[PDB]
Design a protein around this motif. Structure first.
Motif, PDB file in Angstrom:
ATOM      1  N   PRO A  54     -33.191 -51.722 -24.739  1.00  0.00           N
ATOM      2  CA  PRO A  54     -32.849 -53.139 -24.894  1.00  0.00           C
ATOM      3  C   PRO A  54     -33.996 -54.061 -24.497  1.00  0.00           C
ATOM      4  O   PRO A  54     -34.004 -55.244 -24.836  1.00  0.00           O
ATOM      5  N   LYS A  65     -35.928 -54.482 -27.620  1.00  0.00           N
ATOM      6  CA  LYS A  65     -35.067 -55.049 -28.651  1.00  0.00           C
ATOM      7  C   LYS A  65     -34.833 -56.536 -28.408  1.00  0.00           C
ATOM      8  O   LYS A  65     -35.233 -57.377 -29.213  1.00  0.00           O
ATOM      9  N   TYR A  66     -34.183 -56.853 -27.294  1.00  0.00           N
ATOM     10  CA  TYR A  66     -33.895 -58.239 -26.945  1.00  0.00           C
ATOM     11  C   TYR A  66     -35.085 -58.882 -26.237  1.00  0.00           C
ATOM     12  O   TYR A  66     -35.463 -60.014 -26.537  1.00  0.00           O
TER      13      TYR A  66
END
Length: 19
Positions: free
Chosen positions: A5, A8-9
């Motif tokens: 994550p 990703k984020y």
């Protein structure tokens, strides 16, 4: 599991680090 994550984020944010 935590890096997933992160790229990703937080990926676009890591631009400063992962530049």
């Amino acid at each position: 599991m935590w890096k997933t994550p992160t790229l990703k984020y937080f990926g676009g944010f890591n631009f400063s680090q992962i530049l």
